[PDB]
Design an enzyme around this catalytic site. Structure first.
Site, PDB file in Angstrom:
ATOM      1  N   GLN A  32       0.841  -1.189   0.000  1.00 39.43           N
ATOM      2  CA  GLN A  32       0.000   0.000   0.000  1.00 39.43           C
ATOM      3  C   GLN A  32       0.883   1.249   0.000  1.00 39.43           C
ATOM      4  O   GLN A  32       2.087   1.181   0.281  1.00 39.43           O
ATOM      5  CB  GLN A  32      -0.953  -0.012   1.203  1.00 39.43           C
ATOM      6  CG  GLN A  32      -1.618  -1.366   1.422  1.00 39.43           C
ATOM      7  CD  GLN A  32      -2.977  -1.271   2.071  1.00 39.43           C
ATOM      8  OE1 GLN A  32      -3.965  -0.933   1.417  1.00 39.43           O
ATOM      9  NE2 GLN A  32      -3.042  -1.589   3.360  1.00 39.43           N
ATOM     10  N   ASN A  37       7.027   3.728   1.158  1.00 37.33           N
ATOM     11  CA  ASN A  37       6.906   2.324   1.557  1.00 37.33           C
ATOM     12  C   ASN A  37       6.170   2.259   2.884  1.00 37.33           C
ATOM     13  O   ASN A  37       6.440   2.999   3.838  1.00 37.33           O
ATOM     14  CB  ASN A  37       8.201   1.481   1.546  1.00 37.33           C
ATOM     15  CG  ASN A  37       9.441   2.240   1.931  1.00 37.33           C
ATOM     16  OD1 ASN A  37       9.621   3.405   1.591  1.00 37.33           O
ATOM     17  ND2 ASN A  37      10.337   1.551   2.612  1.00 37.33           N
ATOM     18  N   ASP A 152     -11.384  12.246  -2.444  1.00 34.28           N
ATOM     19  CA  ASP A 152     -11.019  11.036  -3.190  1.00 34.28           C
ATOM     20  C   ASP A 152     -11.501   9.776  -2.470  1.00 34.28           C
ATOM     21  O   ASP A 152     -10.779   8.793  -2.381  1.00 34.28           O
ATOM     22  CB  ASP A 152      -9.500  11.004  -3.401  1.00 34.28           C
ATOM     23  CG  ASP A 152      -9.058  10.007  -4.485  1.00 34.28           C
ATOM     24  OD1 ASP A 152      -9.803   9.747  -5.466  1.00 34.28           O
ATOM     25  OD2 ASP A 152      -7.934   9.480  -4.344  1.00 34.28           O
TER      26      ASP A 152
HETATM   27  C1  LIG Z   1      -1.094  -4.774   7.493  1.00 32.75           C
HETATM   28  N1  LIG Z   1      -1.430  -3.361   7.595  1.00 32.75           N
HETATM   29  C2  LIG Z   1      -1.597  -2.563   6.535  1.00 32.75           C
HETATM   30  O1  LIG Z   1      -1.505  -2.952   5.369  1.00 32.75           O
HETATM   31  C3  LIG Z   1      -1.848  -1.099   6.845  1.00 32.75           C
HETATM   32  C4  LIG Z   1      -1.448  -0.139   5.930  1.00 32.75           C
HETATM   33  C5  LIG Z   1      -1.657   1.187   6.250  1.00 32.75           C
HETATM   34  O2  LIG Z   1      -1.210   2.100   5.325  1.00 32.75           O
HETATM   35  C6  LIG Z   1      -1.543   3.439   5.387  1.00 32.75           C
HETATM   36  C7  LIG Z   1      -2.857   3.834   5.288  1.00 32.75           C
HETATM   37  C8  LIG Z   1      -3.173   5.178   5.316  1.00 32.75           C
HETATM   38  C9  LIG Z   1      -2.184   6.146   5.467  1.00 32.75           C
HETATM   39  N2  LIG Z   1      -2.404   7.535   5.511  1.00 32.75           N
HETATM   40  C10 LIG Z   1      -3.615   8.165   5.521  1.00 32.75           C
HETATM   41  O3  LIG Z   1      -4.688   7.589   5.408  1.00 32.75           O
HETATM   42  N3  LIG Z   1      -3.550   9.518   5.673  1.00 32.75           N
HETATM   43  C11 LIG Z   1      -4.682  10.312   5.701  1.00 32.75           C
HETATM   44  C12 LIG Z   1      -5.886  10.019   6.279  1.00 32.75           C
HETATM   45  C13 LIG Z   1      -6.709  11.125   6.006  1.00 32.75           C
HETATM   46  C14 LIG Z   1      -8.150  11.330   6.415  1.00 32.75           C
HETATM   47  C15 LIG Z   1      -8.397  10.688   7.787  1.00 32.75           C
HETATM   48  C16 LIG Z   1      -8.458  12.835   6.483  1.00 32.75           C
HETATM   49  C17 LIG Z   1      -9.055  10.662   5.370  1.00 32.75           C
HETATM   50  N4  LIG Z   1      -6.085  12.033   5.265  1.00 32.75           N
HETATM   51  N5  LIG Z   1      -4.824  11.534   5.063  1.00 32.75           N
HETATM   52  C18 LIG Z   1      -3.905  12.317   4.314  1.00 32.75           C
HETATM   53  C19 LIG Z   1      -3.065  11.728   3.384  1.00 32.75           C
HETATM   54  C20 LIG Z   1      -2.179  12.478   2.668  1.00 32.75           C
HETATM   55  C21 LIG Z   1      -2.089  13.877   2.867  1.00 32.75           C
HETATM   56  N6  LIG Z   1      -1.189  14.601   2.131  1.00 32.75           N
HETATM   57  C22 LIG Z   1      -1.137  15.907   2.345  1.00 32.75           C
HETATM   58  C23 LIG Z   1      -1.939  16.601   3.272  1.00 32.75           C
HETATM   59  C24 LIG Z   1      -2.837  15.895   4.006  1.00 32.75           C
HETATM   60  C25 LIG Z   1      -2.931  14.499   3.816  1.00 32.75           C
HETATM   61  C26 LIG Z   1      -3.836  13.707   4.544  1.00 32.75           C
HETATM   62  C27 LIG Z   1      -0.883   5.703   5.567  1.00 32.75           C
HETATM   63  F1  LIG Z   1       0.065   6.651   5.691  1.00 32.75           F
HETATM   64  C28 LIG Z   1      -0.532   4.375   5.520  1.00 32.75           C
HETATM   65  C29 LIG Z   1      -2.269   1.516   7.442  1.00 32.75           C
HETATM   66  C30 LIG Z   1      -2.650   0.492   8.281  1.00 32.75           C
HETATM   67  N7  LIG Z   1      -2.455  -0.808   8.009  1.00 32.75           N
END
Ligand SMILES: CNC(=O)c1cc(Oc2ccc(NC(=O)Nc3cc(C(C)(C)C)nn3-c3ccc4ncccc4c3)c(F)c2)ccn1
EC number: 2.7.11.1
Length: 321
Positions: A32, A37, A152
């Site tokens: 993901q 990474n 998105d």
């Molecule tokens: C085995 N386990 C797994 O596979 C596994 C994999 C795993 O991976 C990830 C999933 C999600 C994220 N990150 C986010 O979701 N960020 C986020 C949330 C929101 C919301 C809450 C506002 C929607 N906005 N932004 C978000 C993202 C990017 C941005 N860029 C600029 C400004 C603001 C931003 C806000 C991550 F970094 C790693 C997590 C858990 N388990």
């Protein structure tokens, strides 16, 4: 998410068995993430509990972007201290070899992967769609409370736990299919865009099929208007991209190269038929499908001001009855 070659340099490959921040024992990749990474690790400092760590690239743009992400997540974390509103939880952050590293609660899979495992055009049980709809609306409630636009929402950006009982909204081609029409025409937009995308997602969760599989932005508008009829005049006029899609008389210009001028678009999309499919349903499930169709009708209004509110969605018969 948004508040309401040097850009690609500095990738870091973390080795399996590497320890980060003197505590995170990296034992697996996830796959993901787009630019960073994301790995699986055990937290040696907290009883070997499982976490996910995102290692952001070491460059100026992605560093600053990482900091913004951190700020959004802390704001949602603080607004929802008991984690009742179904957004992903950031645990903490650290630095490693100039990479900002974000530590998250572990989750199992995204909803795109869950749909794939149901198989081609199959979809989830209506009871799971009901539960996920409630959780998604709760996420919308928190985002709006925090003045955040996702922009998105789609199955790829929704993760679930191992039992698949709990979803969390998150953010990391497919995006065009979930795009609200106010975005396509270039009108000023608001929290309504995320309600729209949730509607598109719910249809797909139940049918296994993309609601509006439009090849272009022009085709997306046609498919939406095949459901709801022609977009309102006042909405068309406020769009900065209206000239790509509508003429001086506000007639829709359907591209198919040929241009068909349409003063009216007769609604033809039969949402109930498409929901039911080739199923012979029992009256209890059949009732729930009708209620889902009605919820979608209220979500997928072309004018965002006329879409169902978050609270009215939470209290809709689909969820409540
Ligand atoms: C085995 N386990 C797994 O596979 C596994 C994999 C795993 O991976 C990830 C999933 C999600 C994220 N990150 C986010 O979701 N960020 C986020 C949330 C929101 C919301 C809450 C506002 C929607 N906005 N932004 C978000 C993202 C990017 C941005 N860029 C600029 C400004 C603001 C931003 C806000 C991550 F970094 C790693 C997590 C858990 N388990």
């Amino acid at each position: 998410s948004m508040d309401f070659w040097t850009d690609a340099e500095g990738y870091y490959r973390v080795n399996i068995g590497e320890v980060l921040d003197k505590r995170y024992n990296v034992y697996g990749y996830t796959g993901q993430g787009v630019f960073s990474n994301v790995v699986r690790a055990r937290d040696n400092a907290r009883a070997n509990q499982e976490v996910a760590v995102k290692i952001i690239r070491n460059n100026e743009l992605m560093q600053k972007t990482g900091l913004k992400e951190l700020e959004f997540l802390k704001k949602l974390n603080d607004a929802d201290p008991d984690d009742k509103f179904h957004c992903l939880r950031l645990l903490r952050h650290f630095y490693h070899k100039q990479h900002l590293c974000l530590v998250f609660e572990p989750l199992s899979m995204n909803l795109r992967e869950v749909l794939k495992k149901y198989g081609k055009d199959v979809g989830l049980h209506i009871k799971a769609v009901r539960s996920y709809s409630q959780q998604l609306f709760l996420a919308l409630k928190l985002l709006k409370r925090c003045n955040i636009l996702h922009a998105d929402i789609k199955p790829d950006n929704i993760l679930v736990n191992e039992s698949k009982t709990i979803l969390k909204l998150c953010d990391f081609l497919f995006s065009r299919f979930y795009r609200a029409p106010e975005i396509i025409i270039g009108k000023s937009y608001d929290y309504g865009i995320d309600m729209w995308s949730v509607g598109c997602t719910l249809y797909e969760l139940y049918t296994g099929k993309i609601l509006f599989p439009g090849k272009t932005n022009n085709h997306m508008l046609k498919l939406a208007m095949d459901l709801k009829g022609k977009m309102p005049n006042k909405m068309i006029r406020k769009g900065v991209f209206k000239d790509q899609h509508f003429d001086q008389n506000l007639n829709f210009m359907y591209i198919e190269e040929k241009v068909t001028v349409m003063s009216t678009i007769n609604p033809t999309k039969d949402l109930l038929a498409d929901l039911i499919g080739c199923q012979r349903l029992p009256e209890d499930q059949r009732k729930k499908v009708h209620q889902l169709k009605d919820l979608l009708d209220q979500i997928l209004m072309l004018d965002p001001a006329k879409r169902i509110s978050i609270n009215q969605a939470l209290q809709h018969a689909f969820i409540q009855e």
